[PDB]
Design a binder for this molecule. Structure first.
Ligand SMILES: Nc1ncnc2c1ncn2[C@@H]1O[C@H](COP(=O)(O)OP(=O)(O)O)[C@@H](O)[C@H]1O
Ligand SMILES: [Cl-]
Ligand SMILES: [Cl-]
Ligand SMILES: [Cl-]
Ligand SMILES: [K+]
Ligand SMILES: [Mg+2]
Ligand SMILES: [Xe]
Ligand SMILES: [Xe]
Length: 316
């Protein structure tokens, strides 16, 4: 139905809860293959990195997950599909702090290091496979519920302005709690657009980009925390993609850091996180068929351009 990388999100012709069985069976044939690929990923990690405790723990979670998934019998009826949903849920929860554990595990290993680009390739490949598995899984689960304007995790009439505002309020609150104020965010462009879209990736990316913009703005206006320049977001909606530009007046990204900011762990900083925001968002966007580009005006501010392809057709 709705495609993305090579994964499919089924648009269920409901009826006699029949579509659910077709989706459960798909999910059941898909998850163990994706889990195995990531186990191969841990097996090929440099020995010294792979021997790190936390990394081993995560490696063991993936083996365990592969085993429970492999041991569940083929879904034959509603009775099965329903217990499978309990398995999927237990796994999503068990793997809740995986990105966090990976970042910690890998943080130390590269005092010890290997092939400069070797780890980035590993984290890009692991984080995005994770996203895709969670999208598949969350979508099957959601196909049970009946939420207005959704087919599973797919919103049928998503408003970019509305999802942006949701994350603006969130980020502004993290920022006010920390600095006592937060820049206001103005939104322009196609503010009335509504189209079929999956909001999950935007739910990770948008708050990461807004956190970066608000902090850089606050950190560069220490003399007047009570009066800082607005962050400005422009929405461009065309038949090919959705573009969201986030411009701040927070001083820009220094020429001396420009080439490091897209590296996992790199950071200039607790609100910010742990240097994963940008490299993760870009991996996610490219995984989905879009991109994330930065334009730095050193001494003035930064423009961040997020592009995501529309479902599998154009759109207004
Ligand atoms: N909009 C921005 N303006 C200024 N600096 C930014 C901006 N976005 C990101 N950066 C810089 O890039 C670094 C990397 O950011 P990121 O990967 O999100 O990690 P973190 O926020 O946790 O440091 C930041 O620490 C900061 O130096
Ligand atoms: Cl092992
Ligand atoms: Cl195995
Ligand atoms: Cl999408
Ligand atoms: K970084
Ligand atoms: Mg960040
Ligand atoms: Xe899962
Ligand atoms: Xe998982």
């Amino acid at each position: 139905v709705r495609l993305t990388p090579t994964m499919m999100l089924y648009s269920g012709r409901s009826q006699d809860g029949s579509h659910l069985l077709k989706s459960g069976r798909y999910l059941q044939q898909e998850l163990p293959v994706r889990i195995a690929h990531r186990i191969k990923g841990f097996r090929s990690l440099p020995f010294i990195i792979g021997c790190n405790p936390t990394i081993l723990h995560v490696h063991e979670l993936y083996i365990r997950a592969f085993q429970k998934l492999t041991d569940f019998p083929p879904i034959k009826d509603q009775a099965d599909e329903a217990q499978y949903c309990q398995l999927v849920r237990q796994l999503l929860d068990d793997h809740k702090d995986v990105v966090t554990l990976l970042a910690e595990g890998l943080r130390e290993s590269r005092k010890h290091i290997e092939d400069e680009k070797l780890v980035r390739y590993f984290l890009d490949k692991t984080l995005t496979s994770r996203l895709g598995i969670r999208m598949l899984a969350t979508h099957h689960l959601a196909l049970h519920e009946d939420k207005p304007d959704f087919v599973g995790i797919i919103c049928t009439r998503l408003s970019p302005k509305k999802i942006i505002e949701k994350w603006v309020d969130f980020a502004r609150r993290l920022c006010e709690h920390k600095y006592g104020n937060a820049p206001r965010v103005r939104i322009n462009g196609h503010v009335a657009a509504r189209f079929p879209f999956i909001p999950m990736p935007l739910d990770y990316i948008l708050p990461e980009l807004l956190k970066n913009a608000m902090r850089a703005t606050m950190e560069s206006h220490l003399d007047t925390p009570y009066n800082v320049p607005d962050v400005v977001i422009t929405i461009a909606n065309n038949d090919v993609d959705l573009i969201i530009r986030i411009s701040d007046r927070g001083g820009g990204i220094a020429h001396k850091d420009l080439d490091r900011v897209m590296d996992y762990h790199f950071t200039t900083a607790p609100m910010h996180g742990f240097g994963f925001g940008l490299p993760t968002s870009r991996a996610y966007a490219e995984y989905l068929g879009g991109s994330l580009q930065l334009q730095s005006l050193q001494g003035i501010g930064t423009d961040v351009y997020l592009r995501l392809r529309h479902i599998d057709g154009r759109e207004e």
